[PDB]
Amino acid sequence: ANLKPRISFNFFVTAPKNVSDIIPRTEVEKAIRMSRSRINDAFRLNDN
Amino acid sequence: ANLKPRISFNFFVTAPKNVSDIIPRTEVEKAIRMSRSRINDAFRLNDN
Amino acid sequence: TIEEQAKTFLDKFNHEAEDLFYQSSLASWNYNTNITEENVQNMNNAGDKWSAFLKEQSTLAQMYPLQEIQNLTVKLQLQALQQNGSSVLSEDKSKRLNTILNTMSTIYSTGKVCNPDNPQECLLLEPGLNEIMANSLDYNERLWAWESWRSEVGKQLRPLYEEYVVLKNEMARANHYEDYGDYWRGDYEVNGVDGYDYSRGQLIEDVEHTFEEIKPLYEHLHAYVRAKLMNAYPSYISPIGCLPAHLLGDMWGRFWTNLYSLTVPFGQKPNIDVTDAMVDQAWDAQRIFKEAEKFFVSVGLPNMTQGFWENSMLTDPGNVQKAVCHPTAWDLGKGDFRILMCTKVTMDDFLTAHHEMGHIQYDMAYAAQPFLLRNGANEGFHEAVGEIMSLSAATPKHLKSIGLLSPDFQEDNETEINFLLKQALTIVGTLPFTYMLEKWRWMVFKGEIPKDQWMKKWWEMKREIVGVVEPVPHDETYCDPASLFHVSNDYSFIRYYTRTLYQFQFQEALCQAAKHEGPLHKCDISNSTEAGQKLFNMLRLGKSEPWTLALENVVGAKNMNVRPLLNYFEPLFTWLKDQNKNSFVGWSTDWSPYADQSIKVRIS
Amino acid sequence: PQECLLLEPGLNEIMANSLDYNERLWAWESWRSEVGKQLRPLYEEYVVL
Ligand SMILES: *[C@@H]1O[C@H](CO)[C@@H](O[C@@H]2O[C@H](CO)[C@@H](O)[C@H](O)[C@H]2NC(C)=O)[C@H](O)[C@H]1NC(C)=O
Ligand SMILES: *[C@@H]1O[C@H](CO)[C@@H](O[C@@H]2O[C@H](CO)[C@@H](O)[C@H](O)[C@H]2NC(C)=O)[C@H](O)[C@H]1NC(C)=O
Ligand SMILES: *[C@@H]1O[C@H](CO)[C@@H](O[C@@H]2O[C@H](CO)[C@@H](O)[C@H](O)[C@H]2NC(C)=O)[C@H](O)[C@H]1NC(C)=O
Ligand SMILES: *[C@@H]1O[C@H](CO)[C@@H](O[C@@H]2O[C@H](CO)[C@@H](O)[C@H](O)[C@H]2NC(C)=O)[C@H](O)[C@H]1NC(C)=O
Ligand SMILES: *[C@@H]1O[C@H](CO)[C@@H](O[C@@H]2O[C@H](CO)[C@@H](O)[C@H](O)[C@H]2NC(C)=O)[C@H](O)[C@H]1NC(C)=O
Ligand SMILES: *[C@@H]1O[C@H](CO)[C@@H](O[C@@H]2O[C@H](CO)[C@@H](O)[C@H](O)[C@H]2NC(C)=O)[C@H](O)[C@H]1NC(C)=O
Ligand SMILES: *[C@@H]1O[C@H](CO)[C@@H](O[C@@H]2O[C@H](CO)[C@@H](O)[C@H](O)[C@H]2NC(C)=O)[C@H](O)[C@H]1NC(C)=O
Ligand SMILES: *[C@@H]1O[C@H](CO)[C@@H](O)[C@H](O)[C@H]1NC(C)=O
Ligand SMILES: [Zn+2]
């Protein structure tokens, strides 16, 4: 949501097929902590 | 198809929703030539 | 002389037109009444036989140039024939258009969505999906239905609507209009009558200028409903935000009626119902239509006619003799009128009877006019008469006089509120939605919204005008507005706004003739003949006069007003202003049901 | 996507009458994909029981 020039958007994750089931934010904040080093190089960005 | 220990498999691409429409191989061999440098680092491999 | 030339052509037209129309309508009547496969194709034969006559006459009438005619009443009929319509397109284009139109409606009428758990039980919209949204109290179920209908059906209509816009715009520009939008406002336009003029561009000014006076009342009605939803769905609605779009009773949010059971002010007192005092007095579906006729006679209007009693469908046949009972009035022309409805002994049918007889009493008035001038003064006058007739036959000051509602029965000032708020959930609940929807389409049809900002502007106007926020973000691959019936079936949607305003202008201007004293919502025009004249001077005009001149003959002004609608809801506005002391009237357009679990990303 | 086909009529006559390669392949693959995929987690339990 809210794509923009700065490219700063918002995102959230739901269960596979259950639109009313939002994965709590404090778990998305952990999966990304786990695989950030692998999300980065997919785009060549560098954590800053 | 044919996943194995060596991890050497085969793959092919079809149209979005048309199972009987196989993209000819000489175009998959060009898309991959175009974006190989970006497929590599997603896995940290190095073209060898 | 061009004048006489036309004058003679119209005369010759009238006869053929009228007879073919008679034969064409009788077929459809026989079909709708007596469903037989045989009658289906007969109706098609008669219909095409008539419809071809229209094309022949339209081309044949294109000769006489307009700017010579002085007699206004013939310059008015000619304008209805010279209209090229959609024939001005190409051939391949004109038959691509009909294909798109028939594909869009079929998707709406047959598309189905089905459960994630058991993918074998699929649900249509007509039954099933509507009753879920109209009856459920389960947050997750409502959200599933609301999102899945827009996802598995909206997504199909998008690439078709994108073509429909383009084609309809050419069809309009080839008729000396600016676009389709300016084509639709072609109904409210008047030209050269010395002070009764009305330009297609003024309609936008009037609509946007009367809406700024309903915002004070809609804000309070919106802030009160929100405070009563935070008890049925706690922890889901913030008290300074908007309302999630799927908790509004209906699939789209057009009417808030289905929120009555959650928002009734005084739940103990029951509303006025007489569906039982009719059974105890043995009222069959013929004493109803006699009471309606008597009510109309009391005002001053004339009786019914023999043919009306003879050839009508006041009752359901009951056997496998099949029929449709969507209640309608029929004006087959040549001098017969007839109603069609499967009547049940109830109250909501005791009102629908008055409503339909309203249309019938309209038609009987202007049936002395040339065939092309037999219609409402504009599109929003017909159904704005049936209403004001069904609005004055539900008042206890009338029910306790027709015989029901035992005479020792005084109403208290709490059922008054119980009733007004049931009205306001339907009248005032749908004014901002209608205005926003037509504004969006008027802006799409003129390229003021690029083809990649449709949904963005849609959900930007929703939060700002209607005060309703979506529960999941919708990108540009969706098309939500095309999921409504009127949008995906090519129907103008502004009649439902202006009708609501005329409905109360008439009611307010008629009670002053009947010498009413109390509040407006307790007025009753029965037994007042001097208030049947003021109404009969407007019905007996058809389309022969500019609609502003028709309004002037009743209200005394020449434009739609919004003051009389606010005098109707005064006893509710006061009570609402009192009940909203410790709340926050208004809303802030940044809250969203998913903004507390979203993560923000920023890339350089 | 509005015209759905059962197996008993329709899907059988396609496979038994057609001579079009792509149509046969579409039917053969889609019946196994949109129905086989459902029976798998049930068959896995049925075996065990
Ligand atoms: C989708 O996820 C929701 C959770 O957000 C599930 O709703 C739960 O349903 C169970 C029983 O039906 C209730 O006991 C829970 O209270 C519900 N959750 C909440 C937050 O109220 C829902 O069942 C899921 N959908 C499916 C098909 O499993
Ligand atoms: C799926 O792709 C195939 C191509 O492999 C399409 O088949 C073509 O269909 C057209 C007309 O139907 C024929 O003229 C071609 O000869 C077909 N291709 C071959 C290789 O024979 C098929 O139409 C596609 N499916 C859909 C739904 O479009
Ligand atoms: C409904 O329509 C059917 C025909 O579609 C009518 O059947 C006719 O009945 C009359 C007797 O009154 C026969 O003389 C005709 O031969 C019948 N027509 C056919 C095609 O069978 C039926 O009468 C209609 N119902 C009513 C109430 O008029
Ligand atoms: C416009 O033309 C109509 C005729 O089409 C005129 O209506 C006629 O008026 C005279 C006298 O008022 C009647 O005797 C005729 O019967 C009317 N004709 C019809 C068909 O009913 C009308 O008067 C003309 N308008 C003006 C302003 O003169
Ligand atoms: C209706 O469409 C026609 C074209 O089909 C427009 O053009 C006129 O067509 C007639 C033939 O019937 C010619 O005699 C005229 O010379 C044409 N007019 C022009 C300006 O070329 C016609 O103008 C259209 N009328 C309306 C009211 O839209
Ligand atoms: C219209 O007026 C008539 C007569 O003025 C009312 O009919 C009277 O109704 C009362 C109570 O229902 C009876 O006691 C009288 O006997 C009736 N009089 C006649 C002559 O029938 C009628 O009720 C009024 N209608 C409304 C809606 O007020
Ligand atoms: C209905 O009318 C009654 C009588 O006028 C109202 O009751 C009074 O309301 C005032 C206003 O606050 C109080 O000061 C009185 O104490 C009330 N009287 C009693 C006996 O309680 C009542 O408020 C009105 N209801 C509505 C919804 O307006
Ligand atoms: C209308 O018809 C009734 C008969 O049902 C009659 O008594 C009444 O007088 C008629 N109305 C007028 C105005 O003549
Ligand atoms: Zn009506």
Side-chain angles (χ1 to χ4, degrees):
Chain A
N2 314 338
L3 198 33
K4 300 158 102 249
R6 221 227 170 316
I7 331 196
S8 80
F9 44 89
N10 299 242
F11 81 92
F12 66 101
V13 196
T14 82
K17 301 191 310 313
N18 189 15
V19 50
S20 34
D21 178 10
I22 292 193
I23 305 293
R25 176 210 183 104
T26 66
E27 292 188 39
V28 190
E29 277 191 358
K30 291 200 190 65
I32 279 174
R33 263 202 178 90
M34 167 183 298
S35 341
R36 197 176 183 169
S37 78
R38 196 96 166 283
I39 295 188
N40 281 347
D41 49 4
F43 298 82
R44 306 196 165 107
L45 309 173
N46 65 106
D47 216 344
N48 295 335
Chain B
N2 314 338
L3 198 33
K4 300 158 102 249
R6 221 227 170 316
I7 331 196
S8 80
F9 44 89
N10 299 241
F11 81 92
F12 66 101
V13 196
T14 82
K17 301 191 310 313
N18 189 15
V19 50
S20 34
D21 178 10
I22 292 193
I23 305 293
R25 176 210 183 104
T26 66
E27 292 188 39
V28 190
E29 277 191 358
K30 291 200 190 65
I32 279 174
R33 263 202 178 90
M34 167 183 298
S35 341
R36 197 176 183 169
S37 78
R38 196 96 166 283
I39 295 188
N40 281 348
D41 49 4
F43 298 82
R44 306 196 165 107
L45 309 173
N46 65 106
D47 216 344
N48 295 335
Chain C
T1 83
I2 196 160
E3 249 240 18
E4 271 36 26
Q5 251 50 120
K7 274 233 240 147
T8 195
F9 157 67
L10 270 200
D11 197 322
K12 174 180 46 218
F13 164 88
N14 282 159
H15 291 22
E16 291 82 303
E18 155 207 85
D19 284 9
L20 265 80
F21 186 50
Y22 199 2
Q23 312 294 153
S24 165
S25 72
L26 267 151
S28 32
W29 162 267
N30 283 320
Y31 163 50
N32 290 278
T33 309
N34 182 9
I35 304 285
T36 76
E37 162 57 44
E38 188 270 285
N39 296 116
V40 155
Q41 46 78 49
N42 191 349
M43 150 187 105
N44 297 137
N45 304 143
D48 298 300
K49 179 130 147 46
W50 152 261
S51 155
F53 184 50
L54 276 191
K55 308 270 290 191
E56 188 191 358
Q57 288 319 290
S58 148
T59 76
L60 188 36
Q62 274 279 358
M63 302 164 35
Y64 313 80
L66 228 36
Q67 316 82 305
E68 283 77 15
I69 316 289
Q70 302 302 106
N71 192 2
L72 185 58
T73 169
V74 61
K75 182 183 193 302
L76 253 173
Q77 322 190 44
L78 281 185
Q79 278 204 220
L81 258 48
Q82 302 207 160
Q83 268 227 266
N84 265 309
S86 149
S87 99
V88 84
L89 262 178
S90 144
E91 216 306 311
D92 40 336
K93 282 183 154 178
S94 146
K95 72 141 52 48
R96 172 66 177 158
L97 182 55
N98 298 145
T99 291
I100 285 172
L101 283 187
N102 287 276
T103 317
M104 277 199 314
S105 116
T106 299
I107 290 178
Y108 179 89
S109 96
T110 337
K112 48 169 51 65
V113 65
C114 27
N115 226 2
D117 50 26
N118 176 21
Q120 255 66 242
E121 43 163 48
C122 287
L123 289 185
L124 280 204
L125 167 67
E126 178 34 65
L129 217 45
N130 269 139
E131 66 93 6
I132 283 193
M133 304 288 316
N135 298 141
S136 217
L137 288 177
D138 185 12
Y139 187 103
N140 307 314
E141 197 177 31
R142 303 184 69 98
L143 171 57
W144 161 74
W146 184 90
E147 156 66 18
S148 84
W149 168 255
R150 274 149 174 80
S151 126
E152 300 175 29
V153 170
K155 290 263 200 65
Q156 306 192 40
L157 295 171
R158 163 84 167 206
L160 289 154
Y161 206 75
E162 285 188 344
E163 232 174 307
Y164 156 96
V165 158
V166 170
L167 281 179
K168 284 285 198 172
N169 252 344
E170 303 182 1
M171 177 267 226
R173 264 194 299 275
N175 274 64
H176 313 143
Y177 287 120
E178 296 179 28
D179 41 25
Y180 210 14
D182 193 17
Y183 178 97
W184 265 338
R185 319 196 280 277
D187 203 340
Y188 298 99
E189 174 185 24
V190 178
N191 282 334
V193 202
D194 285 56
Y196 301 81
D197 298 13
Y198 206 88
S199 43
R200 301 193 306 264
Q202 256 201 250
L203 186 57
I204 314 183
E205 318 297 330
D206 274 6
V207 155
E208 286 169 6
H209 166 88
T210 71
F211 181 67
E212 283 165 2
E213 292 170 274
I214 315 184
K215 229 179 307 180
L217 164 61
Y218 179 72
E219 277 183 357
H220 287 281
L221 177 59
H222 171 254
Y224 168 86
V225 171
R226 184 179 54 201
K228 276 271 171 38
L229 279 191
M230 290 196 319
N231 302 159
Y233 309 100
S235 81
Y236 283 127
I237 294 189
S238 99
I240 58 145
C242 316
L243 306 163
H246 57 296
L247 314 182
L248 292 194
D250 190 5
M251 161 81 72
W252 304 275
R254 208 188 144 191
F255 304 110
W256 290 3
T257 250
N258 291 126
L259 298 192
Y260 188 51
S261 46
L262 311 180
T263 45
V264 43
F266 308 98
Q268 61 262 349
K269 305 238 203 312
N271 34 54
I272 286 182
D273 192 331
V274 278
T275 181
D276 301 297
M278 303 172 70
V279 184
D280 313 356
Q281 301 183 39
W283 272 32
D284 58 334
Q286 192 111 0
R287 174 85 172 282
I288 297 187
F289 282 96
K290 286 291 186 189
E291 290 305 326
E293 167 189 311
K294 186 189 304 179
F295 163 52
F296 275 113
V297 168
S298 49
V299 182
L301 304 190
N303 252 328
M304 281 296 127
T305 35
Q306 287 300 330
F308 168 69
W309 290 124
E310 264 61 80
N311 41 99
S312 28
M313 210 59 192
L314 311 185
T315 18
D316 175 66
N319 59 310
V320 74
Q321 149 72 292
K322 225 182 161 44
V324 240
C325 345
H326 200 172
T328 69
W330 288 77
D331 179 27
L332 326 170
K334 193 88 95 44
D336 56 50
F337 319 90
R338 39 178 84 162
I339 312 187
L340 170 130
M341 53 179 305
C342 295
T343 309
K344 265 66 187 194
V345 189
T346 322
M347 195 205 189
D348 58 26
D349 279 21
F350 173 72
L351 302 182
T352 293
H354 290 236
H355 182 116
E356 305 300 331
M357 197 144 312
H359 298 347
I360 286 305
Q361 278 279 349
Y362 203 1
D363 292 349
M364 296 175 50
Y366 59 50
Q369 302 260 305
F371 169 82
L372 291 147
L373 301 196
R374 292 176 181 171
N375 228 312
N378 69 26
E379 54 183 353
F381 270 47
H382 250 296
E383 283 289 319
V385 162
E387 295 286 351
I388 91 166
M389 241 72 91
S390 126
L391 211 68
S392 155
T395 62
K397 205 214 68 177
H398 174 74
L399 286 181
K400 89 144 48 41
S401 125
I402 142 168
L404 311 82
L405 219 67
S406 68
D408 324 11
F409 177 89
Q410 26 67 88
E411 60 277 358
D412 42 297
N413 58 327
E414 283 181 339
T415 55
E416 286 182 9
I417 303 298
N418 252 28
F419 165 69
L420 279 186
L421 187 125
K422 174 159 213 181
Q423 292 281 269
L425 279 187
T426 293
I427 309 305
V428 190
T430 189
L431 281 194
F433 176 79
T434 292
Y435 165 57
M436 190 268 311
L437 175 60
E438 262 307 85
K439 199 182 179 212
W440 183 81
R441 272 206 297 186
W442 286 346
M443 264 161 44
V444 149
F445 274 137
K446 73 163 63 163
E448 213 173 302
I449 289 182
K451 208 181 57 176
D452 55 285
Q453 293 176 12
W454 279 7
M455 301 302 307
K456 176 189 171 191
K457 283 311 177 219
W458 175 253
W459 284 114
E460 251 196 31
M461 298 167 76
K462 269 257 184 183
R463 312 153 157 260
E464 187 208 339
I465 305 186
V466 191
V468 159
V469 69
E470 78 280 32
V472 288
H474 277 336
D475 53 306
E476 277 294 342
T477 59
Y478 287 67
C479 191
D480 297 350
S483 153
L484 182 45
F485 170 74
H486 295 257
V487 165
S488 91
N489 276 73
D490 187 25
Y491 277 136
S492 149
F493 205 73
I494 209 51
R495 52 171 98 230
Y496 302 105
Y497 184 97
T498 77
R499 182 256 297 188
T500 300
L501 271 37
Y502 300 145
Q503 166 183 341
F504 289 118
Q505 292 205 213
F506 294 155
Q507 175 79 97
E508 202 272 293
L510 280 181
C511 299
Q512 300 180 13
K515 313 309 294 281
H516 194 56
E517 50 274 61
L520 183 57
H521 79 274
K522 303 157 58 178
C523 166
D524 183 10
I525 53 181
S526 325
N527 266 329
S528 94
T529 165
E530 63 278 342
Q533 290 313 100
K534 291 193 64 62
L535 190 58
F536 186 74
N537 288 151
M538 188 261 293
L539 318 154
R540 194 215 69 261
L541 280 192
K543 201 181 283 252
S544 145
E545 300 292 338
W547 66 263
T548 64
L549 175 58
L551 254 196
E552 173 131 53
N553 270 13
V554 170
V555 177
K558 340 165 82 60
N559 45 351
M560 77 189 67
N561 214 351
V562 82
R563 283 306 311 174
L565 182 138
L566 300 191
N567 302 156
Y568 187 91
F569 290 99
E570 191 70 15
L572 174 76
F573 191 30
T574 296
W575 181 83
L576 274 191
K577 278 218 302 296
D578 160 76
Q579 282 269 323
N580 283 154
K581 277 180 286 89
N582 320 322
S583 288
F584 171 57
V585 293
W587 59 88
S588 95
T589 91
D590 53 29
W591 187 81
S592 18
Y594 50 76
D596 358 347
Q597 312 279 62
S598 88
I599 314 192
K600 185 194 207 206
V601 182
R602 179 204 304 154
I603 304 186
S604 315
Chain D
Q2 255 66 242
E3 43 163 48
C4 286
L5 289 185
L6 280 204
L7 167 67
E8 178 34 65
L11 217 45
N12 269 139
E13 66 93 6
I14 283 193
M15 304 288 316
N17 298 141
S18 217
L19 288 177
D20 185 12
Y21 187 103
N22 307 314
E23 197 177 31
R24 303 184 70 98
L25 171 57
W26 161 74
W28 184 90
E29 156 66 18
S30 85
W31 168 255
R32 274 149 174 80
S33 126
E34 300 175 29
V35 170
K37 290 263 200 65
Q38 306 192 40
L39 295 171
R40 163 84 167 206
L42 289 154
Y43 206 75
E44 285 188 344
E45 232 174 307
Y46 156 96
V47 158
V48 170
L49 281 179

